[PDB]
Each structure stands twice: as structure tokens, then as C-alpha cells.
Amino acid sequence: MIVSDIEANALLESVTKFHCGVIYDYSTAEYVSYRPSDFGAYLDALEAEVARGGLIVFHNGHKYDVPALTKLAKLQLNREFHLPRENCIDTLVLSRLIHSNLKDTDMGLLRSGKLPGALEAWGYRLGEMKGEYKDDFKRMLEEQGEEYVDGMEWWNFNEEMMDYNVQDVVVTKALLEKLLSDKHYFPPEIDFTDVGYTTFWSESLEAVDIEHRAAWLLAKQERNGFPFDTKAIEELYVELAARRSELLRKLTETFGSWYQPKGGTEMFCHPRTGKPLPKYPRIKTPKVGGIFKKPKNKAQREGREPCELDTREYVAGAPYTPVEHVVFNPSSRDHIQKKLQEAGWVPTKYTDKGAPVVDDEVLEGVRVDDPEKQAAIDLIKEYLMIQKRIGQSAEGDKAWLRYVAEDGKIHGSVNPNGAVTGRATHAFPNLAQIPGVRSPYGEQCRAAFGAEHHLDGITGKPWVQAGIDASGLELRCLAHFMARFDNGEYAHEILNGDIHTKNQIAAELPTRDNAKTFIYGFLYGAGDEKIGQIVGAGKERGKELKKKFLENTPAIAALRESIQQTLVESSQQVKWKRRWIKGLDGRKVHVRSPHAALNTLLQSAGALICKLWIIKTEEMLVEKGLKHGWDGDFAYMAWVHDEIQVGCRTEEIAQVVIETAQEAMRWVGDHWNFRCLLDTEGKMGPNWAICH
């Protein structure tokens, strides 16, 4: 086993030069440094470890180092280099599995201070090395007079870079040994730093293997990227900007501008009493200035000739209130609240901070006498929505248009195990929150992401898309877990026609989607009123649906109680018996709250099932001769919880991807002895609007 890390000139997207690398070999207990001209030797050493059936440990090597080395070896040495997946270990992947309850800076992409809770020390260190090295580099330049530029610290190799490269390795080594010391994931009877790769995967908890395979597969999906229709989105941006401007014009005509105090420093005091009046706007008492200018002549200084007028504008001692002119901003909840109350509106609900709530619910219910302002409320709702779309598609910091790469794809980032439950998190941009087709502008947004937007490298023909989503996943998970209470009764009922449509009708709800947000909000602990809001009714209607569904399957109560009995010994300050659930693959799953336990249990089950699912799906495809890549037959474009969108070179392949995903899901179900049959629904089409 060896521990390594490299330093190169840029992020994977445009890296073109290997600067250095360090290797720590457990068999020798020594560190070896490779400088820019030792690149060939560095790669030879990694391959030697592979040839010995050994292991290579990186920190974020799955997403960076490994692919980087493959790319740099090709560019710099014209060498083919491909470390096999089974020989690689990633301490970041391990760290995210074992410390799933914690957050991390995602290797410096996120600000430490903005994250909640604590951060693991070693990993925190590794994530700060880049910014830390940059500070030392800058400090040294300003020490020698030289100026600093953009990011010149990475243009050339230097010994300071080399030293950091060495530190990463000693720190990665320490992190590794810390993770290996966790008895829950690694049996104590085995020295995992002294075994071949097969032993490492077979002797460690199943979760260790799953996490590394998921990260490797997902690293690849990131590189693939999601084919994006830039043109279509820029045209949508124009249309949305026009609508925004029009709404702003109408809203500003209706709600005029006004003045507010701003820039006041001193306290206003009663001229007579002299007592401070903190509630009065802050003021400013000029120090210089009068009606006339100070006398400049002798006689003028005696009252011979009138003094020059002081064009100034202020008079010493004469206080005034500094103000600013403010124009109505439909995006300002504060502005909206101000104008509506000035129109007669009397707020009913306020925030825990005192501000009146101004969301779509209240706006919908606001009633003011003036008919023009009453109508303006709709323009405001539309406006807030238009902004939501513009921000996500064009103007936000993570706007799609700011992320399209040269290859015409958006390479969304994914933290395979970012959520406590074992689900992944998506960001930069978040491809897991694209507006749905049935929401305003949804079809246009959704259609911009699609295989059709990718033209085959050889034939120039657009690729096809295969979208597969697991059927009623978390409800089937529920059936599985309560089977010990109802003997698979629910597990059988659930597959008698669509479960959500069956509930939709029974609950008398408008859409199938509404039935979904209802059942899950209900299943996971929503209160009577929350259930009302979801179904567009009151707390009264909430209690009904609650007792109706809870009465229909009393196993829900039994499952909830058993979970409590297992986690809580006493209880909001809680006394825990155990604070974690045992996931399907053996991992510990932190429970934040007794009340949320059921959600932890089911979301986790669904997450691990889906994770093993996408892994098994790709493997089955590869064993069928299909190659993963734009230069092949298929390409993973996105994984949104229990759904995958795959680009395929041909319809035939798309048909096979859909059927293979179904075989894989059933394999996963059999693999973990699930008490409910698992299924998937697939669709073939040009983009995401049609494939989901």
C-alpha cells in the first residue's frame, strides 16, 4: 500500500502540466519526491504498486488525481495510464462515509465559516492546502517587491509547492490511519495497510466498497457532463428579462418611490429636554458652513462691504436627516410588506424574528381595497417566480449559463455521500433542482438538458436519452420494513396499480405529484396543518387524511414505535440508547432526531439501494460489451436520487440501458433480501423534458 498526492498546474478541466508528486510506501516506510522531470518515474511507481496487487491511497484521487494523471500522461509523455478502480482508495470518500454526520469544504470550494457543526481536522487541513499555499506564495512575492497575479502560484513548480505536496501525504497518511481505526468499518484483527486490494474490499464492511465504486462512477459522470442547449436558454433569458422589465414598469407605476433615512451618525435629542430620542432617525450636524463666507477684506471684516455668500449648502449647528431615494423592488419582501400595509393589508402571520411572512401563500390571500394594487399582487407573484428562473438559468452565481463548458456540457458536481442518510448532494450547479416540466417555464428548462444536444463525434448524429426512475422507492422501503408487522401485506398492496395514483384518488387530490408530497410529508411526521397546506386545506382536513392513512396501515405506527424503542431510552433533550441506524450495507447512519428517525431509516434505505443500483447498472452494461463514454455507447449524464439520465449513441442502446436498469434494480432487491419487489420505469427521448 502506498499513499500519494500530486500537484499540477490547474483543475482537471484544463490541467496540462504535472508539477510534482510524493509517495509514501508502507513496505519501506519512506517518502519519495518526484519533481517535474520525474513524472515518468512517478507513474512507473504507481503502476508497480498495481502490478503487485497492491493499493494506492489519494485524498480526492477519484475525482482529481487519477483522471488528472491519465490526462497528463497522455499530453506530456504520450503514454496511456489508467489506474484500475479496484486498486484505488480515497480518504475523502472514506471520510464522508465514516463521518457522514459532518460537513466538509468540498476541498476548498466551500467557505469553512459558512458550514454548520464541526469539521474533521486532517481533512480540513487537506482542503485548505491550496488557499494556504497561495497565502505563503503571495507573502513571499510581496517580500521581494514582485507583484502577485490572478493565480500565478500554480503556473510553475517551486520547492514551496513540493513541501506542501509532502505535507499532504503525511496528513493523508494520518487521516487514513484514523479512518482505519474505526472498528465498525474495519475489523481490528486485520492490518489494512498491509494487505492486497482483494482483501481490502472483501474484509471491510460492504459500505466501503459501495462508496468507492459510486465515487468512481460518479467522477466519470462529472467528466461526461450533461449536454446543454445554450442557445435555447439564452433565448429563454431574453424572454424572461423582457417579462421582468415589463412587470417592473407596471409595479413601479403602481407603487412609487420614497425616501428613507440613511447615513445618519449622531443621535437626535429633544431641543428643550435634551433627552435622546433613539427612535427618531439618526441625524447629521454639519461642523462648517454659514450664510456668508468669512470676511476676506479689512473693511469687509468690519461691516463695510457685505461678505460673500456661502454657496456651500449647510450651516454649522443646523441638524438634518440624511436620506436616500428608494425605488420599489418587487424582489424585496420588505418593500412588498411596506406597500401592502399602506394599502390596508393587516398581516396575520409573522416570522420568529418579527417580520411579516411574505410568501406565495399569504400573497394569494392578501386583500386590499384599491383594485389596481389588488391586481399588482399577481404581478408580484409572477415577478418573484420570473426571478427564480432567471437566477437559476442566467444571473445567479451558479447559473447554468455561467457553467456551460467548451464541450457544450454542464459538468455538475456531486458529493456521492453528502447527506447524512447516504444520499448524494449536487452542486455547481445543482442538477438535482432543475424546475420540473409541470412548473412554469419547466419544459423549456428541462429540454435544454438532453442527449439530443450532443452530436456523435464520428457521425455527427444527435445522441438519444434513456431516463430511468425507481418506482415508489421509499414507499416500497416502508413496505419492506413493516413486513415484520403486517407480513408483507403492504408490500403486496403497493404493486396493485400505481401506489401514488391509488392514494391520489383515495385522498381526493388534484395531481399525482400532490399525492406524493402528501404521502411522504405524512409518512415523515408532518403536523395536521402542514398536511393541510400540502393538500390546500386546513388543519381539520389534515387530521382526517392523517387518521385515514394511519388507520389503513397501522403497521406504520408499529414501525415508528420499534424505531423509538431502539434509539431512545428517555426524552428537546434526549437520552439516547444508540444514536444511529444500521444501513442496508452496514454503515452507521446518524439520527438527528427521534422524530425524524423514520425518515432516516427510509431515505437511507432508498439511497443505498439506488447507489448500488446505478453501480450495478453500469457494470451490467459494460459486461454486455457497451463502453462508457462519448467515444463509446453510453454516458451517465445525471443521477438525481432514484433517477438516472443516460445518453446513448443509438435507440437500440437506449432500449438496452432501460432494460438493464430494471434487471439491476431487481438484482439489488434480491441482493439485500428486500421484502418488497423493486421496480423502475424507463423512458426513451431526446431530452429531460420527455425522459422524466
Binding site: 412609487g256 418611490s257 420614497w258 425616501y259 433615512p261 437626535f268 431641543p271 430620542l277 427618531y280 432617525p281 441625524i283 447629521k284 454639519p286 454659514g290 450664510i291 456668508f292 457685505p306 455668500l309 449648502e313 449647510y314 450651516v315 449647528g317 443646523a318 441638524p319 438634518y320 436627516t321 440624511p322 436620506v323 436616500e324 431615494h325
Partner: protein
């Protein structure tokens, strides 16, 4: 004796007054504005004949002030033949207003 302006009457009451008009831009929530108010009442009298005192509440009438780049209140704009002859910002005292007026009139 003070003229209470509105956005719609500001043009003919001030910009076409053909005489000296002292306009006061104020707001009910300003400390200095409440101070100078009493002073403007007295001034209105004493200067009746050679000066007209007018007040414009920037809250009730938000369209006028912006055109004059109001950045502080109370703002005292002395108009003569449709144009600003002199401007002074602040709760001047009785005497200071007098010096100012007598000097610009």
C-alpha cells in the same frame, strides 16, 4: 399663510409663481423638520409681501423632490422665476433663516 403644495400643483404654484417662493421639503418622521416648522410659520408672516413660504411633504408627494436631488431633510429651496436661486439643508434657527432670506432677496 403657508402654501401647502402637492405634486400636481407644484408646477404652477412654484415654477410659475413670479415672486420669491421658499419651499420646504419635509417628512413627519424627521426631527429637524419638526424643529424648523414653527420657525417657518413666523417667517411666513414677517416676510408676507416679498416672500411666499410653501411646504411639500415628500411622503404624500414623492414625485417632486427627486427632480431636485434631495439628499437631506429639511431642505429649503428658494425659487424665483421657475428656478432654484438658493438652497440650504438643515434645521436653521429663526435668525439664520433671516440672514439667508434677507441676503437672497
Amino acid at each position: 399663510k403657508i402654501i401647502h403644495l402637492t405634486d400636481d400643483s407644484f408646477d404652477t404654484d412654484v415654477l410659475k409663481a413670479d415672486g420669491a417662493i421658499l419651499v420646504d421639503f419635509w417628512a413627519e418622521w424627521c426631527g429637524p423638520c419638526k424643529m424648523i416648522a414653527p420657525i417657518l410659520d413666523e417667517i411666513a408672516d414677517e416676510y408676507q409681501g416679498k416672500l411666499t413660504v410653501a411646504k411639500l411633504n415628500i411622503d404624500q408627494n414623492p414625485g417632486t423632490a427627486p427632480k431636485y436631488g434631495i439628499r437631506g431633510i429639511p431642505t429649503l429651496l428658494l425659487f424665483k422665476n421657475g428656478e432654484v436661486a438658493a438652497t440650504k439643508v438643515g434645521a436653521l434657527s429663526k435668525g439664520q433663516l433671516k440672514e439667508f432670506l434677507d441676503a437672497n432677496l
